[PDB]
Design an enzyme around this catalytic site. Structure first.
Site: not given
Lengths: 179, 4
Positions: A109, A162
């Site tokens: 991610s 992230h």
């Protein structure tokens, strides 16, 4: 789905299977970011933390976004652009993650965030190129971003992975749209 | 173990 979009999904599935069979820790031991000085020269590890998933939801959501954004970037901008986005996001997200919280982490991610940031910003700053982030999917991305920041899931979120991920994809779309 |  071109060859990069594909080998990636495959490698992630093959790895997820090894984690079910051998256990998470066993696979981590081989694939995690260097967690000991004796491991610093094992170079695959600066990238291979991207390949590990810890739940069915982790894998599935990451590969959905990868397939779609990864796949878009591949078909319209070429395999090479996707390779570089991936290597840079993986390495940078891994770096920031381990700094904040140690080496024990995994997941595509960081890369998926770079693809979000990349495909969005390149669509805003560069219509012609042919890559955009559809308004509906901006919403679904924003919610996805938001969920991690506030930790609205079972397991804890790699928040450095992230922000580092997204920053890379924005920097690269910026640099690309500039022309 | 943080996911991403």
């Amino acid at each position: 789905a071109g060859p990069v979009t594909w080998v990636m999904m495959i490698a992630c599935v093959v790895v997820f299977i090894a984690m079910q069979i051998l256990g998470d820790q066993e696979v981590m031991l081989w694939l995690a970011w260097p967690f000991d000085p004796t491991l610093k020269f094992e170079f695959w590890r600066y990238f291979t933390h991207a390949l590990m998933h810890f739940s069915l939801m982790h894998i599935l959501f990451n590969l959905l976004w990868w397939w779609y954004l990864g796949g878009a970037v591949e078909k319209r901008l070429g395999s090479g652009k996707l390779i570089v986005i991936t290597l840079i996001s993986a390495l940078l997200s891994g770096y920031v993650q381990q700094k904040f919280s140690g080496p024990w982490f995994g997941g595509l991610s960081g890369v998926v965030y770079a693809l979000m940031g990349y495909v969005w910003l390149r669509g805003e700053r560069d219509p012609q190129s042919g890559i955009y982030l559809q308004r509906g999917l901006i919403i679904f991305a924003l919610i996805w971003i938001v969920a991690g920041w506030f930790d609205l899931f079972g397991m804890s979120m790699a928040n450095g992975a992230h922000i580092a991920g997204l920053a890379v994809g924005l920097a690269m779309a910026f640099v690309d749209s500039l022309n | 173990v943080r996911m991403x």
